[PDB]
C-alpha cells in the first residue's frame with residue numbers, strides 16, 4: 001500500500017517499557033518530627049539562613065570528593081567540576097541547590113535525613129523555646145531541617161558512586177518517602193529542590209539570593225553560580 005509521506009502520529013515511536021520505582025515510607029524520628037513542626041509553624045525573623053545550611057552541606061560533600069581520592073584515586077579521573085549551582089524557577093516557585101559532591105546512597109537518605117536522632121535536637125528545641133535565633137540551628141547538627149523555614153515540601157535527588165539514583169521527599173507531617181529515581185540521571189551529586197511557601201518567594205529573586213550568599217556563605221571553598229532565567 002504505497003505511501004509518499006506520513007503524519008507524525010503514524011511514525012511516533014512506541015514508548016520504552018514502563019519503569020517501576022520502588023517507594024518506601026518512613027516516620028521521622030520523634031524529636032526530628034517535633035523539630036520540623038516547631039520550624040514550620042513558628043515565626044523566625046532570620047529565615048534566610050536556610051541557604052547557608054544547604055550550601056554548607058554541599059561544601060562538605062565536595063570536600064569528601066577531595067578526601068575520598070586518598071583511599072580511592074579513581075575519583076581523580078572524573079571530569080566533573082566541583083561546584084554548586086543555585087537555580088531559582090519562578091514558574092514553579094522552586095529554588096534548587098545542586099552540587100557535584102559525593103551524593104548519598106539509599107541507606108544514607110534513610111539514616112541521615114530523618115530516622116536517626118541527632119544528640120543535640122532536644123537541646124536545640126529548648127534553646128529555641130528560651131528564644132534563641134534560628135541561626136543557631138547550624139551548631140546543633142540538624143541544619144538540613146532549616147529548609148522548612150521557607151519550603152512547604154523538599155525533594156532531594158541524589159546519586160552516589162556506590163548506589164543508584166534516589167529521590168527523598170517530605171512535606172513534613174511526620175514521614176518521608178525514598179524512591180528509586182529512574183528519570184533524568186543527574187550524575188554524581190545531590191540536588192535539593194525547595195518548593196517555596198507562597199510568602200517566601202523573595203528567595204527566587206537574584207538580588208535576594210546574591211545578598212544572602214554574600215552575607216552568610218563566603219567561605220564555600222568551591223565556585224557557586226546562580227542561574228538566572230532570562231526575563232521574557
Ligand SMILES: Nc1ncnc2c1ncn2[C@@H]1O[C@H](COP(=O)(O)CP(=O)(O)OP(=O)(O)O)[C@@H](O)[C@H]1O
Pocket residue numbers: 053056057058060061099101102103104112113138139140141142143144145190
Ligand atoms: N548536599 C548533600 N550532599 C550529601 N549529603 C548531604 C547533603 N545534604 C545533606 N546531606 C546529608 O545529610 C546529613 C544531615 O545534614 P545536617 O542536618 O546539615 C547535619 P551535618 O551537616 O551532618 O552537620 P553540620 O551541619 O553540623 O556540619 C549530612 O551529614 C549528610 O550526610
Ligand SMILES: [Mg+2]
Pocket residue numbers: none
Ligand atoms: Mg498522542
Ligand SMILES: [Mg+2]
Pocket residue numbers: 053056057143144
Ligand atoms: Mg549540615
